[PDB]
Amino acid sequence: LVLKYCPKIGYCSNTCSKTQIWATSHGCKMYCCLPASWKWK
C-alpha cells in the first residue's frame, strides 16, 4: 500500500482514522490519510 506521494485529496499524518486508508505515501514522513471513498490502485 505504498504511494509515490500523498494525494492532494487526503492529508499525511502519523496515523489515519480507520475509515481512512493507511496509504503509506513515500513522498511523506508519516502515513497518507484518504477518505474511504478514495480509490486505491
**DSSP string over 1-41:** -EESS--TTSEEESS--TTSEEEEETTSSSEEEE-TTS---
Strand order in the sheet with 21-25: 2-3, 21-25, 31-34, 11-13
Distance CA 25, CA 6 (A): 5
Q: In this structure, how many other beta carbons lie within 10 angstroms of the beta carbon of residue 26?
A: 10
16, 24 contact by CB (below 8 A): no
Per the structure, how many domains does the chain have? 1
Method in brief: NMR
Distance CA 39, CA 7 (A): 11
What CATH code is carried by the domain that includes residue 40? 3.10.360.10
The CA–CA distances, whole Å, from 1 to 6, 20, 32 equal 12, 13, 10
Largest CA distance in the chain: 23
* 10: containing domain: 1-41
Q: Which amino acid is present at 40?
A: W
